[PDB]
């Protein structure tokens, strides 16, 4: 089974320069190389067929290179709809196996997040389970790490995490971090605090509550 | 149109090999024949397609054809190989055929010979005419390098002198005329006329007189 | 043109029977090949096989044959994919494709726009709303936020808006994750300066279709009695 | 009297004629097609010893009927040119090319050089029968007809 | 055998019209692999190549001079004529006629040519005189003797010695270009000196352009 690799895992390029995307297969395959561009929640379309054409209506900004068992895609200047997920496929034997993807991003300069915390309301008290959050907005890059410190130790397990999209505007980044418990499990424990650990802050922030506090 | 191109003169010492080369851009999948012509003569085959031989052509030419060069080789070179040689081909974007230039062989290193000179009047009814052209002849002399000078009791003439570049014949050698035209008054006017041949520090010296018989 | 056409998105339950149809058409439909493809959240994209609707030949890949069936109606000229008995690994997004040119070797011409395939044990229930309040410890820089938290629904997509449309902007939703009971969660959140806390309400609208409910719940401060 | 070659699918393949030229006449050469991607098993053309009443017994390709109706004949190439030379690129050519059957198919011509038709990336569709035509300029006609199949159906 | 020939006139005006003939034996242009074409040669310059034609009337003309060219065949009597008009002085050459077999590419078999000259003066007659022998060119008891044609136009000239029986010995030099611009020239014969007063030395000289024959003796000079 032919295996390939994708180069680099992530883009960050600004508009107006370029970027070069590296794409490795493992044997020789020709001249049978596909470049595909796809967007969020939309069909992928060709960009490059046989490793040097271009298909109907693909502006000249694509140029793909490359033979044997290596090839490369260049493209010159990135217009603001050009930040997109891009596939390299081989057509020579079967299967035909595909690529992990390249994402390509938009650089600014780093934003320190605003961080919130919301406590459970009596609802949730009185139907079930209780459910705390912890919430994160408007910071870049998306590399940050939230910990939850239930009374005064680590708790692990029992967080799921969601991350957003690139803002349209000022490409800030924002995730939610959920931690759920019963409600004997809520009850049995004082004081319940979120810490945040990001590269852009000089140090990790806490924030903490204790039970009955509005 | 394909270009074709010569050197234009090559030497060559006595009884030595020579080679003359017809080349141009990527020659080798194309004809290229040699076609040889004496001065004063109809022009010969020797060699057509790429090295074979027509009946009485001799055996010392050898054609070569290989990448971007067509090669004529003569081996044990006489004086009787000085000729002219051409090389043809048969362009096909014209679709007609394309001579050269022309190469001249030079066969120096022949053995050096004193020149015989002779002098001669116009006759009796040549003068009766009113006219007078007297004719130096210049015989057996090699290499073809003499100058001609005509002397009225040693003062240089220069009205009326005609010197002829010397004329190679059948035996491989060369033969020059000059001639000086006056009126058969100005001819019995003068003294001594002399015809003075010079050749290669040679000097070759005849007169007449008007007084003396022809 | 060229055009392809699918069919609508498929909720089904373990252990039961599927076909999905492609349609095609502005061009001769024998003399080319068309093809399926899958995308699942996890192991990438594949190919699954191609057919060539003039001789009914069939080339599947190693992985999946004996998994599913590839057919060609050349009368109403349409592409079929059955399964067998759907297994709970088969919820995915499907594709059909045409080849660029009339070679077998040649890249992904044209295609769809993809079929949703959802399977699971759950039954269709209804979301439950709650709200993530504004107080003084949710304040940076003189900024408050609140939002609601959508919980227990099934199956996707749920609508969420924010005081029916005024407050638009500066709005954030995350998208869905799946728990481990099989029900979806998620929050929204908006922002808003100190000075109106109490004068606004905020009432936050929450749509579900294939279980009919349309709840609208507010967020207000949290009062300490 | 036919030729019988047989292909298999992603290996090249070449069709080569008799040509017996004579220099200084100028020549025309011709190539047709006559193609099975509707005619397909017994449906297909198929070579058959055709025996005359009692003398000549000859290879001929049958075509079924119905393979017929649905089946036009087409021209691929022409060439002309006049013999000369011994070497290639001493010769000169001019071609035309009015085949438009492979064009609505988006696949490859084949190629064709005088005496020789050269396909580099077998298909599917390629298969079926080939007539190839010689004329001069003093009367002289030639005819030549291939056939390609699948391999392996020679045997069956 | 192949034999091919030429024949034409040799003076022409300044832009006037040109016309050659060449006539071939020993094969027919009915065949298919033979074609007939006509080249030049300039004072010491590169062969030329002015035209060819094959057997159905195709034509094959140089690049250079295309516009002013005609060749035409004539197979039932197995000649060929070209017509080259607009004659320029530079244009002065040698011309030839050859054959081309299209199974080499080359052209094997060559004719002898023919003289084509531009001048603006008109034909002229010999002016023939006995150059006799003298006694300081008397060297080794060899003695030269001869006839000098001088004031003659155009070129060439055809000389026999006693009917061209006589070729050892024979020095015929070739012409020469004077300050009036006319040609001169002298065929002579160098002879032992005890058969200077025994053998008969007589000169023929035909001009073909002014179709002239003239015969003259040549003695050794007697004082009077």
Not at chain 1, 28 to 37: E, G, K, P, R, T
Not at chain 2, 81 to 106: I, M, N, R
Not at chain 2, 130 to 158: E, M, Q
Request: hydrophobic share 30%; with cysteine; aromatic share 10%.
């Amino acid at each position: 089974e032919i295996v390939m690799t994708q180069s680099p895992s992530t883009l960050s390029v600004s508009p107006g320069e370029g970027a070069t995307l590296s794409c490795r297969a493992s044997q020789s395959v020709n001249n049978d190389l596909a470049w595909y561009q796809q967007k969020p929640g939309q069909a992928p379309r060709l960009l490059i067929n046989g490793a040097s054409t271009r298909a109907t209506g693909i502006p000249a900004r694509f140029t793909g290179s490359g033979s044997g068992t290596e090839f490369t895609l260049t493209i010159s200047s990135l217009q603001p709809e050009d930040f997109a997920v891009y596939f390299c496929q081989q057509y020579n034997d079967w299967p035909r196996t595909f690529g992990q993807g390249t994402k390509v991003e938009i650089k600014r300069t780093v934003a320190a997040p605003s961080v919130f915390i919301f406590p459970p309301s009596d609802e949730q008290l009185k139907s079930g389970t209780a459910s705390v959050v912890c919430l994160l907005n408007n910071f870049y890059p998306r590399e940050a790490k939230v910990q939850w410190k239930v009374d005064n130790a680590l708790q692990s397990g029992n967080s799921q995490e969601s991350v957003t999209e690139q803002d349209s505007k000022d490409s800030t980044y924002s995730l939610s971090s959920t931690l759920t418990l019963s409600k004997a499990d809520y009850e049995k424990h004082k004081v319940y605090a979120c810490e945040v650990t990001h590269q852009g802050l000089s140090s990790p922030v806490t924030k903490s509550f204790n039970r009955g506090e509005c | 149109s394909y270009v074709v191109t010569q050197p234009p003169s090559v030497s060559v010492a006595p009884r030595q090999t020579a080679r003359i080369t017809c080349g141009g851009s990527n020659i080798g999948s194309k004809s290229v024949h040699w076609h040889q012509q004496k001065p004063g003569q109809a022009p010969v085959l020797v060699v057509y397609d790429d090295s074979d031989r027509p009946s009485g052509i001799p055996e010392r030419f050898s054609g070569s054809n290989s990448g971007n060069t067509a090669t004529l080789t003569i081996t044990r070179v006489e004086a009787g190989d000085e000729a002219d040689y051409y090389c043809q081909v048969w362009d096909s974007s014209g679709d007609h055929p394309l001579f050269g230039g022309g190469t001249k062989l030079t066969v120096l290193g022949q053995p050096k010979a004193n020149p015989t000179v002779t002098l001669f009047p116009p006759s009796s009814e040549e003068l009766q005419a009113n006219k007078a052209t007297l004719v130096c002849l210049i015989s057996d002399f090699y290499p073809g390098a003499v100058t001609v000078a005509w002397k009225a009791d040693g003062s240089p003439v220069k009205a009326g002198v005609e010197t002829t570049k010397p004329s190679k014949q059948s035996n491989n050698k060369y033969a020059a005329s000059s001639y000086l035209s006056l009126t058969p008054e100005q001819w019995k006017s003068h003294r001594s006329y002399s015809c003075q041949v010079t050749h290669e520090g040679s000097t070759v010296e005849k007169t007449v007189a008007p007084t003396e018989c022809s | 043109e060229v055009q392809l056409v699918q069919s609508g998105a498929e909720v089904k339950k373990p252990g039961e029977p599927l076909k999905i149809s492609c349609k095609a058409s502005g061009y001769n439909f024998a003399n080319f090949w068309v093809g399926w493809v899958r995308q699942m959240p996890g192991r990438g994209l594949e190919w699954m096989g191609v057919i060539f609707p003039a001789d009914s030949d069939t080339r599947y890949s190693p992985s999946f044959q004996g998994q599913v069936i590839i057919s060609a109606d050349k009368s109403t000229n349409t592409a079929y994919l059955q399964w067998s008995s759907l297994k709970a690994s088969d919820s995915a997004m499907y594709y059909c494709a045409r080849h660029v040119r009339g070679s077998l070797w040649g890249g992904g011409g044209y295609w769809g726009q993809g079929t949703l395939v959802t399977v699971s044990s759950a039954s269709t229930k209804g979301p439950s709303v709650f709200p993530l309040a504004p107080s003084s410890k949710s304040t940076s820089g003189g900024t408050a936020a609140l939002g609601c938290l959508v919980k227990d629904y099934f199956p996707e997509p749920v609508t969420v808006s924010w005081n029916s449309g005024a407050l638009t902007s500066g709005v954030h939703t995350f998208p869905a994750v799946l728990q481990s009971s099989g029900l979806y969660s998620l929050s929204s959140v908006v922002t808003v300066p100190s000075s109106s806390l109490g004068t606004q309400t905020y009432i936050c609208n929450v749509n579900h279709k294939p279980s009919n409910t349309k709840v609208d719940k507010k967020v207000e401060p949290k009062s300490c009695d | 009297r036919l030729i019988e070659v047989s292909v298999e699918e992603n290996h090249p393949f070449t069709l080569r004629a008799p040509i017996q030229r004579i220099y200084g006449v100028r020549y025309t050469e011709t190539w047709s097609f006559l193609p099975s991607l509707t005619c397909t098993g017994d449906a297909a053309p198929a070579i058959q010893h055709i025996c005359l009443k009692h003398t000549t017994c000859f290879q001929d390709v049958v075509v079924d009927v119905d393979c017929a109706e649905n089946t036009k004949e087409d021209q691929l190439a022409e060439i002309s040119y006049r013999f000369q030379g011994k070497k290639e690129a001493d010769q000169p050519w001019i071609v035309v090319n009015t085949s438009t059957l492979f064009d609505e198919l988006e696949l490859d011509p084949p190629e064709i050089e005088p005496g020789v038709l050269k396909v580099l990336r077998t298909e599917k569709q390629y298969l079926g029968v080939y007539i190839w035509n010689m004329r001069g300029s003093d009367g002289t006609s030639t005819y030549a007809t291939f056939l390609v199949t699948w391999k392996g159906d020679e045997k069956t």
